[PDB]
Amino acid sequence: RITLKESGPPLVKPTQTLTLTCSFSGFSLSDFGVGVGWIRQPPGKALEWLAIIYSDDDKRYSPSLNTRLTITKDTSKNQVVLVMTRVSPVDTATYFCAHRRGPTGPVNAMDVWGQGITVTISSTSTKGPSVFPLAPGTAALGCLVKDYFPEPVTVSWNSGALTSGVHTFPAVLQSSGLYSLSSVVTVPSSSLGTQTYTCNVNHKPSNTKVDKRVEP
Amino acid sequence: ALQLTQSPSSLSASVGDRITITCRASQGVTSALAWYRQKPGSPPQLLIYDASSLESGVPSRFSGSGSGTEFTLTISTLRPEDFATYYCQQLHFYPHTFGGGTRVDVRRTVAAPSVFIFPPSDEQLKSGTASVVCLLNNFYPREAKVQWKVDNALQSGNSQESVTEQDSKDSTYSLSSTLTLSKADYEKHKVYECEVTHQGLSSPVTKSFNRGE
């Protein structure tokens, strides 16, 4: 039926402007009522309403983001554009654009959403990770994959041969603009002296491969 | 603006369970209230529009009621695909507002975490910084508190954590906290302890190490 989609830059630097585009098809902005809004959602946090624009141009913004947002619509392309200025790391989130019906009672909801595009703010250039050990019956051991950019990084243990006991945690964007994530595997003691544990790290975005062995 | 208080904020249920979640409005929004289900990694999905109307294509198990300031979303029989986060949104006043979301995870017996603390490495310790991490492995429920202490001074504003998603087999969670000190600060303190507070523990449990020893 109706499908919408977000385009734009996944990486954006503090201060600059973030221009997002909503390309849709299944309706048009010529249909009476029809609205297209922008909803953003930080990491692991709630949905936040950004702005809405309708078939005839009235637009409403978020009182909090009002002086920083500008919404427009090109009806020849069936696109809606959103410009957010002077961004900071707190603007890092996933941005969604959704469709709103028009009067035919049921214009009370946003029935179809884009799939979302996750934007990340970071005055930072590409950078490979440094791999440190997190080392010692149940026993834990792991790898601290620190200071890399941008996502993602892939971690496996013993070249994939070890999969159970493993927990690769979500990376965190540090105050430095760089990422950091830990991967831990839980084994049972006894093997700590006969078994061997190596985490294979691969940050494709910077071509960095590291095999790290961990022990007491 | 218009505040929407969702509650519970987090819920724990099983399949075939029947749960009712509410969404409270600070001001009367008539019936301009929508409900969405959101599975991790996927966008919100409309379930109920106009407060009580079931959105075409949505299972009949979902339903909504309310008007003005009180609204609910009920799931007659909980399915595997329902363990997600739910949000309500009102479209009566500008700005359009969302609630804080309600979380529905899989219920299992309380499981206390297995705590491990990892000191920084000598290799890291010469880049100029010391990362000490605490691991809270396989617990339930999700709620856990981690406090860092260096020579007993409670640490604040220099740690970061991330939790994994609920395991699809043992339904537990695992957390990872990283205290970041600068090498110099790391070396003028002795006890590095990680204190975990969790429903499966009668008293908080601490894991510590003495830098040098």
Partner: peptide, 6 residues
């Protein structure tokens, strides 16, 4: 202000 179709 009120939503637009209120």
């Amino acid at each position: 202000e009120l939503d637009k179709w209120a």
